Symmetry: D2
Subunit: 459 residues, 4 copies
């Protein structure tokens, strides 16, 4: 169809004032003309879309989620069942999460940890309109990290499951890259980091620091025992390669140091720079990130979500309060360039059942809720009700080099948009009320989504 959406009150999300009396046309995919005129106008064959009493915000863009849920895998009881159920139809399961986002208005997602052949499949099944879902740029595995049954993720179950299964699934995820590279000389690293890269992942996440946490973490004490995965020399050896392909660089930082190094490594996208596992980002580095110009994603929680979570002693609750949010504001109020990151996904129905109602009410990490929560809380961090959005908008997409394409709302750009019911401003939570989601200049049947309920099957 060729469509005209009329009488929209438009948030470009660029940061400009919202403008009412705005009428947007779509050509093909592709936004066409943006102006009010009275209209613009309509080419008589153009499909009508009535935009009275609604808003257009650019289609939401999530910079961090895992289409197959690693927060659970990291979480981790229930990793084994969810992998064994759903094995071999994973690629359709990945497309499940991709839909839940889009259903909630996220047109495009960046996934930083997954199984590469199913997540590439998914990225291929979705773009070609074989499979309904959100546009996915595949991160691949995160380099230097082991499988779902390794450490880095839930470690027991190495002993509770058949060895042949436990390794089987790992090799899917780990591919030829990953954590054994610790030991070995960069020569062979260099070798195996482009054989991998040649696989078509959009991006590279270089795991600069350890993923061993729930495994080691202490039952009274909070965090400790951060480590550093790779040699400082070995670390450029993958940045050179990453630079060579044209994929940008994403980085796992978990400690004040290794964040520093990640900033010195010139990494395009910093994934959870706010979790420094410790002291707040030394008031030094903020003015290096800010100064040395690479984008910074923060992952957040409400106070109200936290207030509950320590009330129930969630132990994933420590991350919410405590030096971590008292640390982001500095970057916010220092105008660090900010990204939408909630490590996220679509968990097994049983793992929701274990959590307290307090805990799974409005859970940030659940892929439908995540971008709303994040946009709601960030303001709680001293952020105007805009930018907030984009925020999710341009800033995740400015930070990958997808900015010219997504999105949007501007002429000659992919037409991905969401229509709201109510003012996004003073109440940032209105992003939830969505009369329509358009993608690639196309309508989404939101009412019936997902296309095939799989991981939402109970019983």
């Amino acid at each position: 169809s060729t469509i005209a959406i009329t009488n929209v009150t438009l948030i470009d999300g660029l940061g400009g004032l919202p403008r009412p009396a705005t009428t947007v046309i779509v050509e093909g995919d592709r936004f066409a003309t943006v102006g009010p005129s009275d209209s613009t106008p309509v080419p008589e064959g153009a499909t009508v879309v009535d935009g009275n009493r609604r808003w257009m915000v650019p289609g939401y863009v999530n910079g961090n989620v895992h289409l197959l849920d690693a927060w659970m895998f990291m979480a981790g009881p229930g990793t084994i069942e969810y992998l064994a159920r759903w094995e071999g139809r994973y690629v359709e399961v990945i497309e499940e999460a991709a839909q839940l986002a889009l259903r909630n208005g996220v047109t495009t997602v960046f996934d930083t940890h997954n199984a590469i052949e199913p997540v590439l499949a998914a990225r291929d099944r979705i773009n070609a309109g074989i499979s309904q879902g959100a546009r996915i740029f595949a991160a691949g595995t995160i380099v230097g990290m082991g499988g779902p049954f390794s450490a880095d993720f839930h470690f027991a179950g190495r002993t509770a499951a058949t060895r042949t299964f436990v390794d089987r699934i790992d090799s899917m995820f780990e591919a030829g890259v990953g954590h054994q590279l610790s030991l070995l000389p960069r020569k062979e690293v260099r070798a195996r980091v482009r054989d991998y890269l040649s696989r078509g992942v959009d991006m590279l996440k270089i795991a600069v620091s350890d993923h061993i946490v729930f495994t080691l973490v202490d039952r009274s004490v909070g965090f400790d025992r951060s480590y550093q995965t790779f040699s400082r020399p070995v670390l450029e050896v993958m940045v050179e390669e990453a630079r060579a392909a044209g994929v940008p660089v994403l980085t796992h930082s978990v400690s004040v140091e290794a964040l520093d190094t990640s900033v010195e490594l010139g990494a395009d996208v910093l994934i959870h720079a706010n979790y420094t596992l410790g002291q707040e980002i030394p008031n030094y580095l903020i003015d290096k990130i800010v100064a040395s110009d690479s984008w910074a994603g923060l992952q957040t929680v409400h106070d109200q979500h936290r207030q509950g979570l320590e009330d129930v002693g969630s132990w994933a609750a420590a991350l919410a309060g405590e030096p971590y949010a008292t640390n982001e504001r500095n970057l916010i109020s220092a105008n660090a360039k900010i990204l939408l990151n909630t490590d996220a996904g679509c968990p097994s129905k049983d793992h929701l059942a274990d959590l307290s109602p307090v805990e799974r009410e409005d859970r940030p990490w659940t892929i439908g809720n995540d971008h709303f929560h994040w946009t709601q809380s960030m303001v709680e961090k001293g952020m105007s009700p805009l930018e907030a959005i984009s925020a999710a908008t341009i800033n995740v997409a400015r930070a990958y080099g997808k900015a010219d394409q997504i999105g949007s709302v501007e002429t000659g750009k992919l037409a991905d948009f969401v229509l709201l019911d109510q003012d996004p401003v003073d109440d940032i939570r209105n992003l939830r009320s969505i009369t329509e989601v358009f993608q690639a200049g196309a309508a989404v049947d939101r009412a019936a989504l997902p296309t095939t309920p799989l991981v939402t099957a109970h019983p």
Copy 2:
């Protein structure tokens, strides 16, 4: 309807001399009339089917298996994934379990330990010929023996798998019966054995003594603790109820104590009969058994498999090794009334895979191979091949009281039998070489089984 045989050389299945040049005829399941007159009638319209060069042996009746394969449950691992994928298809995974008894010749099966619902629904489905398999009378669960994920079975996996999942399944097996009742005053236990009987188990199997033996196993002091779950006045209570509902009473016994205990009640069948855990059976017993009217189940391993388990140190080898055989035989060579008992069921294609190729060839614990294994080994413990197949066929029937229904090939009994190229009387193992298999006056398509494959699907 019709079908008959010519000039077959049959073992009457009572250990009577095989009479060659002999013939069966049979109309509409159960056998019509047998013996040659060197005219055995053909009343025309009749299936001319050749019996030369092959033998007529009654169908195998395996008096212990586990259609959900509970053996794999007391660990190894690989239960967690197994129960997860397959949950809600359970009836099918079992029926496939049942079929692989038919292919390898077992025409009838009693399941000592299962979940009542999908095993009864598997039986209720077969019995109606709604599906293919070996006739099941299904004890349901065992009384006093609880969750697949508790102790008794896969103890690790409370912590590896979510509580919802574990709690959901644990209830699937326990019924109203199970672990607790160790606690209940017995007259209220009376309620909950009885609620259980009315459900439709064809029999009742109480666990006189623990299953904790295998979680922990442990540490290679190759024996050392047993316990007992109920008090005798509860046993004598439990058997009373088992009597009036008309069901056979079966008994799990793992200690020198607890067999004398098991027999006194009047249990018809003693599963795990030879397993005394660190001890040879007392003559005082070898007498209590031989004199007092009860059947002993025995489970055994090859002499070329025995030293395989010992070699790779399989931690199953404690059973193969040491006092079980000298304890086995002393029941055979005291002339006890024994039974074909092998715990078994389909294992994870993976749980198979972790195993050594030694453990894999000749494996006792598969549903297909286990009777071939059993009859073979049992002669190696000093049986008479003709008599051991009595253990395979009539003996199991007479235990549960099924002799008038199944067993030996006599007149008026269910028409179930097997035709073999080589000779059982010469070599019992050559009960393997089958050409035709018939259950209920019906040929079985020997290639189709298991129809819908799940656990077997390779890869």
Copy 3:
């Protein structure tokens, strides 16, 4: 020199009204003459005691304790270090606990589970006067149970400690009995049971039920499984052999059966009586105990300490409230027959530091404060102050057959007794105030006790 005590108020604690203005006269230990008169005079050349405005109570006797901490163990952790450090000095740890017992006024103590080598020798040491301490009786191991580093106790550490140490330190306990005993023929048990009793244990405590409730560790839950360690022929096979040596048979029973069987052998002392684990003893059984001639050892906790533990949720908090306190009133309300049973001991210096001060204060299971607490709660359950007083003194002696020697100020009997400022009758907590402690005629120096501080030495 013939201790002679004038003007006191004597609680005979046979229940009778305390008689003031009374002097009891001691001739070389073994009290000779209680008096009315006014005094029934002070023969001559006797030592001087000053009794007016003070109360003499019988020197308390303890119907269960653990000198080597058993309690703590079950625990769990803190056993690997405590038993490791004090190895071979064990024998002095025993007396040290009974150095702690005496100074608060416990003049006699019955230990149930302990290590014969240390437990018995220490008593031989104490009685003949080599070491200061409170008289010891000592069942040795509980036949039917293992030791500290197995199940029944601190399971863990098996895999965290040395196999050589592991095996060495149980089998200090286990002796000939406990693991094994379950396996063997009754015939071989009664040889081993007879053999062990030969070592002069004063008692036979047999574990009628299991001691593993702590693999039954669980939260969101409470205990479900209990087992009965031996068959009935073995349990009464033993009680024969205890009858041989003329020793009392004590029973360990945590199920509603089990306790019932304990009853059916006529066990002289029921240890753990009120603990049937999650069930309430039916009044048929409350009646079975009261009619059948045997004693109910009753373990207790503060209504406050319950309210104390219930808050910080001590992992032992479940026996404090719950069906376990609520019944036992049942046993006493019905004139049950009573005995002062407090599993108790002297924990490692650390074992206390791991405890919330709401548990380090007024702890029931610390051998110092152990009896004071038990009496205080027994009045709350519904005892007349004296009869709790009678039952913390003579009953326990009368249960085991010691009322020939200890427990009442009736003459002939051992001179154990205690003097306090305050009247226990109008507050039984005012038993707490000790002025003098006299054992076997002799005064106790309560200032320097324990003589050599070991476990009380910090650090």
Copy 4:
């Protein structure tokens, strides 16, 4: 004093043609003269010692040892008992081991991981002649590794004992260092290092890669997973302070990086240099090392032990074979320095008892054979018993800057020397020939050692 030990064939341990027909004068430690002459002659008034038929070597110095024997603490079981029992006598336990070193000829011992207060006390005591042991130098703990109940050491351990004893003991090592250093900025990592030396540990060791053999405990997959405890700037900052103090800095490296990072920094000693954890030092790195001028300690085994080890199931067996071994070979022959390195000490009598008799004879990690086994296996890998004999002496001396004090019988040097009844140059193995041992000029009574035995005391 004037000690003169005469007509010995002297090896000053410089790698020359040995010096037969010699007499060396000791005047008050600190050798006065050396020349064959006839003697030189003797100054009388003097201890003339029989030098008949015997050699003189300066006596060994071990450049890697733990006097709490932390090779067991990863083992780990049997860590707890050891630390639990000896505590408070820890100071005597350290001195305990230093005597077995002196008993076997090690005249000076370098201690690379321990608790400060005990070891600096033990050190300071031996120097002060207030106790008898091999002189101590003692790096203190190794920075970046936490207590022995943490990762890097005994697991499980930590959850199987009190949290106080775990916390008290842990802290005692960590000294302010290890673990958290991970958490905190280079700027306050720096300051926290400055405080540490303040007590004067005599060198600095810093773990460039992690101690976690036992977060990976898979036979089969085996060795994978390595980490670095510090980013390069933190190693940098740590390194200079170590210079500002003038303590030799030593490196713990287990990856092909680390090692390549450790030479980059210029840690004098690289400990664990031949351990690539699964990879063989690259050419270019071995010829990087030789230019680099740092001293390489290699931990070596007999081929005799390695077959023995591997024929057990010995968990170190990998460490003997593979490149782990095949590496020292490629390092010795590049004309690269070698340092005498064995982590070693005295394990508890129970730690040894578990192992096969194969494993406990000639055990490299035991402070009795530790050097001997080591020395022999250098000549087995291509050293010259002239250069291997010294590899235990002048290198370890030269490595720490003690070179003008220890390692050769030479200019104004403390008299440490040991007298052999055999020729070491002929068979190295002949370093087991000792007759007497002289430390600081004085003889020590060698069957009198250890003076007080704690760990040794069997049983």
